[model samples]
Target chain A: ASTKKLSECLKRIGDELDSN
Target chain B: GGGPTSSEQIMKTGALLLQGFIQDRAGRPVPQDASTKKLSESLKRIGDELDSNMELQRMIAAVDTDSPREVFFRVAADMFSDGNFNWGRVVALFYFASKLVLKALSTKVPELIRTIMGWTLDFLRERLLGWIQDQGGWDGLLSYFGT
Candidate 1:
C-alpha cells in the first residue's frame, strides 16, 4: 500500500516539477 | 546507542500492548489493566517470547541500527509512548516490517516478528485507524523509522 502511494506520490511530484 | 536496558523498556511497553490485546480477545477491556505486578508476569512472558527467542536474539545480535530487531523495537517503543497500541504504531510497524521482510527473505529471523507486523496492519485498518490516514499523517513514521 505504501509502495502504491510512493509511486503515485513520486509521479505526481515529478510531473509538477517538470511542468514548472 | 539504545542500550539493552532500553530494549527491556521497549519490551515492557510492548507487553502492555499485548496484555491489553489478550484481554480484548478474551472479551473484556476492564481487567488486565496496567497495574505493575498484575501485568508484569504476562508481559514478561510475551516479551521473552519475542525478545529472547533464539531467532530474534540472533537478529538483534547482528550489526546495524536498521536491522529487523532494532527497527521493530524502535518503532514499538516510540509508538507505545502514547500509552497504548493504536493505529499510529500499527501503520508504522507495517512500514518497517515490510522494509525488513523484503530484505529478510535471506535472513533467519523469528517468525512472530513478521507475523505481528501483518496482524496489526490488517487488524487496525480503516475500521479503527482510517480516521488518522491523512496525506502527511504517516510521513514522519515512514521517514525516521529506519530509512
Candidate 2:
C-alpha cells in the first residue's frame, strides 16, 4: 500500500517542492 | 479491557460477516439490502448499549484504545474480501457512524483527537482493501474467520 502510490505522489511533490 | 459484556454479539455478527463470502459464491451481485440494514441496526444498538454502561464508558474513556464502535467497524471492514466489499459504501457508512459517535461525545474528546480520528478513518478506508487481500486473500479470510 505504501509503495504503490506514495512514490508517485512523492515524485509529484518533488517537482513542486516550493511552488506552493 | 477486562469485563463480561456481550461478546456473543460480536461472534454472531461475525458469522454473518462470514456469510458475506457468498458474494464470491457467484459472480453476480446479491441483494444485500436486508443484511446491510440488519448490520446497521445491530451496530447502532451495540454502540448505544456501550454508551449507557457506566463501567464500559469509564473503560472506553480511560484507556487509549479503540472504542467498541471502532472495533466493530474495523471488523466489518476487515470482513470484506480484498476486492469484494464496496469501498465507497463502506467508507460512507463508517464516516457516518464515526461522525455520529463523535457528535455524541463532543465534550469528552479533544478537537485534535477528533481530527486524527477522521484522518485515520479516511486512510484506512482508502488503503485497507489491498492490505486485507495481501494478508491471505479472500479464501484465507474465510478460514481465518472460520465461517
Candidate 3:
C-alpha cells in the first residue's frame, strides 16, 4: 500500500546514498 | 574599372549596400567599404532583419522553388560565358542578393539561403579572391561595390 516512515523510494535512495 | 559580368541594377544595389545601409547589433551602420569587425556585424544584421519582417518571411519559406533565385544564378553565369570576365561585379551581385534575402526574409530559411551563402563564400575563396586580392589587398576588397 502506502509507506509512512521510510518509504520504498526513500529507503532505496537512502540505501543508495549510504553506499557511498 | 568593372567586369563584363557586372549587372547595373544588381551592382547598383550592391554599391548602395557597400556604402553601408545595414546596421550592426550595436546599432552602428555596417559601411560600404566594410571592415571584418563590421563584416560579421552585417551577417548578424541579415538574420535579425528577416526575423523582423512578416511578408518577406513568407517569400523565403518558398525559396527552394523561387524562380527569380534560380534565374539570377543563371543570368549571372552568362557573364562568365566569355571564360574571361569582370569578376568583381559578379561578387557584387551576391552581396546585393544577400541584401535582398536578409531584408525580406523575416524568418529563417536556412535550407537554401544557408547553402547558397556557404557556396558564395567558398567560391569567393576559390574563384575570385586571388585575382582581386593579389592586385592590391584589403582596399581592393573594399573597392568591389555590388548589390
Q: Order the candidate numbers by TM-score, best to worst.
A: 2, 3, 1
Relative to the unseen true structure, what is the C-alpha lDDT of residue B122 in candidate 2, on a scale of 0 to 100?
91
Across residues B76-145, which tens digit of lDDT does each residue of candidate 2 receive? 4443424343433343333233433444455566877989999997987688867876876668778888
| Alpha-carbon deviation at B85 in model 3, angstroms | 3.3
Binned by DockQ into CAPRI classes (incorrect, acceptable, medium, high), candidate 2 is: incorrect
Please list the Cα RMSD from the true structure of every candidate, rounded to 1 decimal place: 23.7, 25.0, 27.1
Per-residue CA lDDT of model 2 for A1-20, tens digit only, reads 22223223223322332343
Clashing pairs in 1: none
Clashing pairs in 2: none
The lDDT values for all models are: 0.46, 0.45, 0.46
Error of 3 at B34 (Å): 11
Model 3: residues >4 Å from true position, as ranges?
A: A1-20, B1-66, B102-147
lDDT by residue (tens digit), candidate 3, B61-122: 44343444654454345434446433343333333355444444534576679889999989
lDDT, candidate 1, at B107: 55
